Design an enzyme around this catalytic site. Sequence first.
Site, PDB file in Angstrom:
ATOM      1  N   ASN A  11       0.859  -1.186   0.000  1.00  0.00           N
ATOM      2  CA  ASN A  11       0.000   0.000   0.000  1.00  0.00           C
ATOM      3  C   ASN A  11       0.893   1.233   0.000  1.00  0.00           C
ATOM      4  O   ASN A  11       1.454   1.606   1.030  1.00  0.00           O
ATOM      5  CB  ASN A  11      -0.895  -0.010   1.233  1.00  0.00           C
ATOM      6  CG  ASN A  11      -1.803   1.180   1.305  1.00  0.00           C
ATOM      7  OD1 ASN A  11      -1.805   2.039   0.419  1.00  0.00           O
ATOM      8  ND2 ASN A  11      -2.610   1.232   2.357  1.00  0.00           N
ATOM      9  N   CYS A  16      -3.973   1.434  -4.951  1.00  0.00           N
ATOM     10  CA  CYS A  16      -4.985   0.393  -4.776  1.00  0.00           C
ATOM     11  C   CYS A  16      -5.674  -0.016  -6.077  1.00  0.00           C
ATOM     12  O   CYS A  16      -5.997  -1.199  -6.252  1.00  0.00           O
ATOM     13  CB  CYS A  16      -6.038   0.809  -3.762  1.00  0.00           C
ATOM     14  SG  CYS A  16      -7.007   2.246  -4.251  1.00  0.00           S
ATOM     15  N   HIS A 257     -11.262   4.071  -2.599  1.00  0.00           N
ATOM     16  CA  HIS A 257     -10.363   2.959  -2.381  1.00  0.00           C
ATOM     17  C   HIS A 257     -10.899   1.742  -3.117  1.00  0.00           C
ATOM     18  O   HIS A 257     -12.108   1.561  -3.258  1.00  0.00           O
ATOM     19  CB  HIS A 257     -10.257   2.631  -0.895  1.00  0.00           C
ATOM     20  CG  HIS A 257      -9.223   1.595  -0.571  1.00  0.00           C
ATOM     21  ND1 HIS A 257      -7.870   1.863  -0.542  1.00  0.00           N
ATOM     22  CD2 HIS A 257      -9.358   0.295  -0.235  1.00  0.00           C
ATOM     23  CE1 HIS A 257      -7.212   0.750  -0.235  1.00  0.00           C
ATOM     24  NE2 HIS A 257      -8.095  -0.208  -0.031  1.00  0.00           N
ATOM     25  N   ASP A 274      -6.852  -6.773  -0.053  1.00  0.00           N
ATOM     26  CA  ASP A 274      -6.855  -5.341   0.260  1.00  0.00           C
ATOM     27  C   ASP A 274      -5.397  -4.914   0.416  1.00  0.00           C
ATOM     28  O   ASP A 274      -4.841  -4.957   1.502  1.00  0.00           O
ATOM     29  CB  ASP A 274      -7.647  -5.070   1.504  1.00  0.00           C
ATOM     30  CG  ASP A 274      -7.785  -3.572   1.794  1.00  0.00           C
ATOM     31  OD1 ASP A 274      -7.184  -2.762   1.068  1.00  0.00           O
ATOM     32  OD2 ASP A 274      -8.511  -3.235   2.754  1.00  0.00           O
TER      33      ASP A 274
END
Lengths: 340, 76
Positions: A11, A16, A257, A274
């Site tokens: 990240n 993303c 996101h 994620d």
Amino acid sequence: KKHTGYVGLKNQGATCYMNSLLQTLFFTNQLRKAVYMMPTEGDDSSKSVPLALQRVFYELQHSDKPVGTKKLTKSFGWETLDSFMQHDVQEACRVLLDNVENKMKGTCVEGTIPKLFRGKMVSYIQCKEVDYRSDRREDYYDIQLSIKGKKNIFESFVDYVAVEQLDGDNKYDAGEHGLQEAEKGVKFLTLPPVLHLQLMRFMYDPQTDQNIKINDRFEFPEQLPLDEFLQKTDPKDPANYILHAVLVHSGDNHGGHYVVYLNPKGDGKWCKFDDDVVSRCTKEEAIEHNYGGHDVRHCTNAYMLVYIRESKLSEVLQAVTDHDIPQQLVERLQEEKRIE
Amino acid sequence: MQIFVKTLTGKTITLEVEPSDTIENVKAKIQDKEGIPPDQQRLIFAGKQLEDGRTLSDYNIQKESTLHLVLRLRGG
């Protein structure tokens, strides 16, 4: 924590959208294998999106720690101070697949991308008040599905292929008859092994003079039969599709996101990806919980869906091993690691 | 020449264009008819996103070709 067997992507804040796309494509195993065969030996590593994709895939396949994508980010060139940091995942898909498709032309893997993703449709036009008709066959690599006022994917496909009236300010130019009221319809001719669906979760709002996200409830199934939307079906190969990935956006048109839910093997065993964290989840968490309509949950819902044709699943999701990665590419990548 | 555009509700609109029209010109015509600001429009044809600065002729877009209009859901 429940074993997943899969590694995440770092990240870096704005990454993303690309991380979600990369997992989606990495687990399109037949594509991953072709990507490893691309002849990038002479490529400039600071410029080559194809080499950068090979590198990311290699590390997703081998690393026990979250994988970085700096060289892909740099060569793709989208996250910059002159072009925004946050991006649309379907836009990224269109541009990345076109880049890789071009690189594979003239090689042993040429045509892989259209074989996996490209279908064909036909548009028909028939005038109402003069005898004049036409058709036109066109390719697609994804399908834009309307969602406003539609309860589910089936209703969206029903509407996609439904006859519409061309009238008013949208009359058809019927050659020497000039503008003519007409009926127009679309039918699918083929549907590809890997079906990308873009849910059109946006509209212009004249009341505020701006584009907004549509967060309405819209259902999609694990099993998707599409034979009824074809002009002609094949009894030996029904257009039955199986849900592979749900690319989920949280936010509005202008930011938010992305995550992706996948069942990589097509076996109903789902995980949530994620960025750096990959976790097992239930079917409901990947499917129903991404239907929208909760009025962050209120703006978190599916944007892009990936289905795989049942008859193609064992080929699309064929195992990928070290036997599939050319030694010359392995050596180049290890050279980079050792140098640092 | 008349092309078709599929709008954000999946309806077909017509557009009167010329082969030498740029993608930006096409987006301006969509704005005139649908009200959507050009800097937010994206146009898909045969799986390719059309690029500003190029013309319809560059993509072999002809009478009765259909372009697909989408916006963006940006995320990081």
